[PDB]
Amino acid sequence: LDAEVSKWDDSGNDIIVLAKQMCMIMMEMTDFTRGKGPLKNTSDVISAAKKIAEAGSRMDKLGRTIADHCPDSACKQDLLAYLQRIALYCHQLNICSKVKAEVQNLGGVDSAMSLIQAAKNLMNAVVQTVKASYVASTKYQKSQGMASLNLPAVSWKMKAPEKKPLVK
Amino acid sequence: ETTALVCDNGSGLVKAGFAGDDAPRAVFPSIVGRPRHQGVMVGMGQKDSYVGDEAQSKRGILTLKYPIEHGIITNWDDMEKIWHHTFYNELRVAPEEHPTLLTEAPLNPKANREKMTQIMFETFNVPAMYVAIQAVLSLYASGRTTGIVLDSGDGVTHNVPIYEGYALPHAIMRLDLAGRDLTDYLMKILTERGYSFVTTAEREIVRDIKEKLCYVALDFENEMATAASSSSLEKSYELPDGQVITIGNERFRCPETLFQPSFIGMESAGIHETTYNSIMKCDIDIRKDLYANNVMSGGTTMYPGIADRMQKEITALAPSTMKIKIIAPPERKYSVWIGGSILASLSTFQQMWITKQEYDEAGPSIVHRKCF
Amino acid sequence: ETTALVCDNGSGLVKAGFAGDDAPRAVFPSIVGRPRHQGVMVGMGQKDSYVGDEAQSKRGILTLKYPIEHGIITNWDDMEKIWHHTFYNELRVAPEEHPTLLTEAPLNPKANREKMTQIMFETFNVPAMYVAIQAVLSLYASGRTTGIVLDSGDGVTHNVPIYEGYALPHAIMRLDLAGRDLTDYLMKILTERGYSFVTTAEREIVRDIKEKLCYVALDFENEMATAASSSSLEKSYELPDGQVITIGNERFRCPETLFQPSFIGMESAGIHETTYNSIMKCDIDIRKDLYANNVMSGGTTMYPGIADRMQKEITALAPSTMKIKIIAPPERKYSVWIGGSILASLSTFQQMWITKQEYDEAGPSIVHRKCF
Amino acid sequence: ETTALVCDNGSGLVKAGFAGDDAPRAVFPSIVGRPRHQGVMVGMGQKDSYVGDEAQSKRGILTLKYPIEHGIITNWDDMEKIWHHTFYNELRVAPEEHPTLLTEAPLNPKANREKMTQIMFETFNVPAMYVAIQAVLSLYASGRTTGIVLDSGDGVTHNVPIYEGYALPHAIMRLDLAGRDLTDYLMKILTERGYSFVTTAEREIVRDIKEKLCYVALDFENEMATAASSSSLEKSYELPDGQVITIGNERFRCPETLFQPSFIGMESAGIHETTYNSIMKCDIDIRKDLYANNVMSGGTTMYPGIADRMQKEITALAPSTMKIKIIAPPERKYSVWIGGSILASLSTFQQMWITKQEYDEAGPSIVHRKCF
Ligand SMILES: Nc1ncnc2c1ncn2[C@@H]1O[C@H](COP(=O)(O)OP(=O)(O)O)[C@@H](O)[C@H]1O
Ligand SMILES: Nc1ncnc2c1ncn2[C@@H]1O[C@H](COP(=O)(O)OP(=O)(O)O)[C@@H](O)[C@H]1O
Ligand SMILES: Nc1ncnc2c1ncn2[C@@H]1O[C@H](COP(=O)(O)OP(=O)(O)O)[C@@H](O)[C@H]1O
Ligand SMILES: [Mg+2]
Ligand SMILES: [Mg+2]
Ligand SMILES: [Mg+2]
């Protein structure tokens, strides 16, 4: 349920764009549970899960690059926690796809559903670390080390949230 | 061209947004949760504290603590976590670009406001800040300048009488009975039905029970009598686990603590009697305008039927020759925020902030000779 | 560039392989066989003990002993023989070049884990070792982080509820009824057909009978009733000698011990009732997610139709307003291994082993303040 | 000339006798046992249920059930069996000739007390009955009228502060951690020694282990540290079968749950911290007398050394300028009975029963406007 969270543009250019790729591949992945998308058998779900695993490893790399220059605890510990979560989810997805592929070529819907739940947890972790990396980047923009990565607050496309309903 | 930030740091719901607006952008419960179990998975064990809605979603595995109890702040290391979540994580603004406006219940300790403005200056580096009384903003939100304010939040319940511009500080009546005590009394009174809610994660569930079920009776004795012939006052509420619960007279014995505080042992008067007690502390000339202008901010005045009982219970105490009008606006839960969106965006206000150059030469004691 | 070794030392099937892989390379029954006859030939009399599949092939002339009964280890001199056969004779790796990961059922004696890591260090000289709970790895293999695990192996049957990262150790329910007790009850219940299986070499044959024939009925009473009109429930199985056997209601009275442990005299609840009993030991907020995520590892949850009866038997106990989903993965017999291939190969794990330099200064008591 | 019957229907031990006496005549565990085996002998198969000591003597062949769990009564058909065994089979009196006095933990469900007095009237036909709070009788037994009562029975643990005659019902703190949870935690913590107690007939054995071995340490950390150098804290206990068991730190980790309820996962405070938490709910004037008068009824306050740790653990929380005196009477296990022998035999009480002519016109709802 991150389409309401994924209100961005094609800016950011390193973090937001692969986050949008992972969001659209989740939105096409979990449509297979409704069964009206471009996914027919189970092996394309394995290739999709391998795609999100590789993209989560790349996001883990970029999150490790931004986390070196954050000075102290206040957001850096949150960022490291979400990085360990996304590392666990991607590495679990990587070699959970292999056992489902080997079950497939040696002998049928719940097999997709486990990878669907793993991808859902991976997507929640990746939007959490996108938010945490935004906080860590725009918190310490005057600090040395952040300015060399060249990620200003304008480059993030996070608008202010909606007006909360006053009644009902 | 710059805007001002307003942040009502309530006892149960932090609300925050920009000045000049008409609704808060961020509203979330001011809870700090520590995990209390082992964490056998090798990931998801480093996240040491959770704040706001991500703690409200995961409340089964967290000890939950409110840093604000009865208006005062008892844990500064959690309150700076909540403010850090408020500005960066949900409003997504930097504090150094916007001046901020915070909210304080009247007759609070001075050390609370002092450490509040010290944390707001020497940690977030705001350009300017202002703390305002929680009840004087409700009259801004109601559009009026006369009247008394019955602000019953989650922490405290305060009545402040304000004639046209001028408050009366000798009649500010602050009572420590509010929505958290009604929640604890609902925990205590639901034991007689058989349901046991013991941990701090079940306080959220019984708070939701108080949200969707509890109303206040116009007359208490006959409504108690008709609950003995239990035919139409029971109501079923579904738990997060799936078990349904049936509630009878506990549906209206919980807000009745607001009008009879002897149920929880508090030696005080109910919110109908301290209002007439506080108007009678005022002068005899402004008493007519204060009787006829009774605003009600705060979420604990959002029970179904509290305006009718407030009017009926004042009009048995007041003289019967001029009317009582308990004006209850429909958006009143956010009312303390709405006036905060007014006063911060008002054009004649901008030379009554507390600038950083005014703070560093006078220390944190500048906040007393500026706000009240 | 080095890999990690994982070795699930189960009660009936030792499985072992390398981390990062998708299937165990070695799987063999954890049996130690001593010959019990004279041995008149002058050769073939010096081989004093047989382990693994070469004991399973020659079981007619061997007393067979499992060193692991009900999770604990009762014979260390046979368990080191089984591990020595595991590393050298079938995996063909040296233990000094690869770190190892072993598997332990929860609520086991501490002396079992202590002697296990002492044998793993001071005999095989591994660089580092880690023992993990047998049920927490099943959630790694299922791809999830919430849910309760019904791991019913050959020795024990344990239910562990784990919300997202955090286990609940006060609700770990370990029941000593598993596949070996079903095998003994099948030995006891096949006597009424006329077939007598008395020695320990016939336990393997009746285990194969349990493998290929025994299913579990959705409803037990009417399925018992239709077995009286014996027309379609009989099935013939061929023995290793050549005699065929016919099996009627014994085909489904054997897994019914999992749901009615009073058949073998165990004062307990069945695996449908201890699951709802263990979810109700948890907190009321996480109960919705635990009801909807019910993984099933272990080989004794590979009967044909145990997921349907587990769902039907929980949904008569749970509240009927939210669904129960007994998620049963098709590779679940190796599921405890698969998560062991995950956690050992995970990048954020490698500073949570037990190195040899951390063991020699603190003794074997270091394994309690590292694993659980 | 007639006497009154008193019957403390506890959660683990029914005690009963006559008023005016100094000791209960009948004390027996409130267990109902159903046989669970075949019964091949043609006699001795008709006895369908066993209650009291004849079930405690034959517990190997019976499923044992307590009808009272955590103060409330979950099985009325067994509770009337226990009361029928109490009056006729062991006290040998008729209920129609003596008025009766029963005992109830505070903050119980009203339906429990309602069905209790309905069963006491319309089944046994007592002349009059009265139900009293389990903690207010402990002050009668201690000879005092001021003080707070820490009644930790088998079901519940309740703290009731009572100044001279007048209780404070808004400070009655009832915690669901008592001797049965310590028994279950001792079952859980003795698994690490190797001993498995799984059935409900072994709960009696581990309860006896808790009886004769478990003490509570004055300081927990250094006593845990000296158990690592295992030289003098082990103790051997003989089982009913003949096997001896050795117990080390499990001897004092079992009562430590009373002061750290996070061991069994309970989000609460220990009985040292809810006492200071409950005194602070009272008023500031009576706080001096409540600090200096701390009675302790209930059997779970009969551990060797609980008074010393209770005093040491309060005096780190209380202000250090006036003393804490945990008064621990030596007969305190029967203390709830002793005050019941006082209040029923008191001369000014006999117009405060509930007569049968007062019950039939008002129904079972008369018990709420008479007792509390
Ligand atoms: N419709 C309602 N009915 C009953 N109680 C309400 C309602 N809305 C809010 N509340 C109570 O009011 C509180 C809302 O927080 P509030 O006190 O308005 O924040 P603040 O502390 O900033 O004033 C909640 O704790 C809840 O108990
Ligand atoms: N396909 C199957 N059908 C029925 N039972 C099975 C099947 N596969 C395995 N089992 C049972 O499960 C056991 C397999 O060992 P297992 O319990 O998985 O090892 P571990 O004790 O390590 O979990 C065997 O004893 C057998 O009784
Ligand atoms: N000498 C003792 N040492 C430790 N614990 C005891 C002792 N005597 C009794 N107990 C505990 O107190 C309980 C005795 O029952 P009790 O609680 O007195 O009955 P009631 O529920 O009627 O008060 C037992 O469960 C046991 O755990
Ligand atoms: Mg407030
Ligand atoms: Mg096993
Ligand atoms: Mg008792």
Numbering used by the authors:
A (entry chain O): 698 to 804, 811 to 871
B (entry chain E), C (entry chain F), D (entry chain H): 4 to 375
What did the publication describing this PDB structure actually write?
In AJs, the extracellular domains of cadherins mediate homophilic cell-cell contact, and their cytoplasmic domains are linked to the actin cytoskeleton by β-catenin and α-catenin. Specifically, β-catenin binds to the cytoplasmic tails of cadherins and to α-catenin; α-catenin binds to β-catenin and to filamentous (F-)actin. α-Catenin has three major domains: an N-terminal β-catenin-binding domain, a middle (M) domain, followed by a flexible linker to the C-terminal ABD.
To understand the αE-catenin-actin filament interaction in molecular detail, we obtained a three-dimensional cryo-EM reconstruction of ADP-actin filaments bound to a truncated αE-catenin ABD (residues 671–906) at 3.6 Å resolution, which we reported at lower resolution previously. This construct deletes the first half of, and thereby destabilizes, the short H0, and binds 4.5x more strongly than the complete ABD (residues 666–906). The helical rise (27.4 Å) and twist (−166.9°) of F-actin in the reconstruction are practically identical to those of bare F-actin, indicating that the ABD does not induce any major changes into the filament. In contrast to the local changes in F-actin, the ABD undergoes large structural rearrangements upon complex formation. Compared to the unbound ABD crystal structure, the N-terminus through the last turn of H1 is disordered. A key part of this change involves the long loop that connects H4 and H5, where the first strand of a β-hairpin becomes a two-turn extension of H4 (residues 795–801) that forms contacts with actin. The CTE past 862, which is disordered in the isolated structure, forms an extended peptide that interacts with actin. Finally, we note that the CTE sits between actin and the next ABD along the long pitch of the filament, and V870 packs against V800 at the top of H4 of the neighboring ABD.
